[PDB]
Symmetry: C2
Subunit: 178 residues, 2 copies
């Protein structure tokens, strides 16, 4: 075990078996740092620093997935949001500040095409890491992409420029050589 | 010493001081498998599995950077690639197979505007993890987004549907608790 950083990656996958667990031996503000230290340590191309995040829990967590599971009207296509608001302790949701990405498109009008793409790179860079780290604490977590649904459902104290990217619900190659 | 996954995230930064180093105690194929299992264990959304990569070295490394540092005409814009060919051991270049995403767009024409984003997310996940893990071995690495240029410089053994995303040259959050 050295840069056994791989073993933490290999032991990680989508977990739907979820109970609103603390979990054992680890509080909430513990989790708060874990994602915080990733947003702070994740390289955004050209120091744009566009990706942010919001963690939601309790009746504020249940409040959103209950809103999605009403915009979903077919029962068998709502056993995902309602199993997210009745089985999960909370959910980490990630954003990308479209603000800077609009500024870089301004000052560098010639490269105003890689900027939206360089932001999509870094936001998925904090997603996989927070996810792979939450599962190290003991939690179980899964992906969700109800972006537009939670975006409208999102409260008012949110910057409207924060584009919704993901919802982390917690609870070979060729080588040359010719 | 527990889920000290964070320590590797913190102990990671762009390195330009590069010598074509093995490095000590670590062969090349040592590096090869590190990324090989990051591409393999990365959650491509909807199991599209579009993440591709190529490790480049030797006079095939200097060959491509010599091509980029020749389309750059102004000296001060050649200081990057010519230092990437004459100071580096090699480069990991990452792709996203446009194949599956095109298939997903076809089958689900309604969601055909989330697939390119779900591909940009997953590539911006194998990049950061490889970079974070290559520096665990002792190497020095950095981001390089000289796309199209290196893409054109690529030989013919590559699929023309592989989209060059990056070149890995090796050598606050609101709590919403009401």
């Amino acid at each position: 075990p050295t840069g056994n950083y791989l073993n933490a990656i290999t032991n990680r996958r989508t977990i739907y078996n979820l109970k609103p667990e603390l979990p054992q031996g680890v509080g909430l503000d513990d989790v708060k740092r874990t994602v915080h230290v990733i947003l702070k340590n994740t390289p955004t191309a050209f120091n744009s620093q566009v990706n942010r995040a919001v963690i939601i829990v309790g009746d504020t967590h249940k409040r959103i997935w209950d809103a999605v599971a009403s915009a979903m009207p077919t029962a068998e296509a709502k056993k995902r949001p309602e199993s997210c608001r009745d089985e999960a302790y909370g959910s980490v949701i990630f954003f990308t500040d479209l603000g800077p990405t609009e500024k870089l498109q301004r000052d560098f009008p010639a490269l105003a095409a890689a900027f939206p793409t360089c932001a999509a790179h870094t936001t998925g860079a904090v997603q996989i890491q927070s996810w792979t780290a939450l599962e190290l604490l003991g939690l179980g977590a899964n992906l969700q992409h109800y972006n537009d649904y939670v975006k409208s459902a999102l409260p008012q104290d949110v910057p409207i420029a924060w584009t919704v990217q993901s919802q982390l619900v917690f609870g070979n190659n060729v080588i040359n050589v010719y």
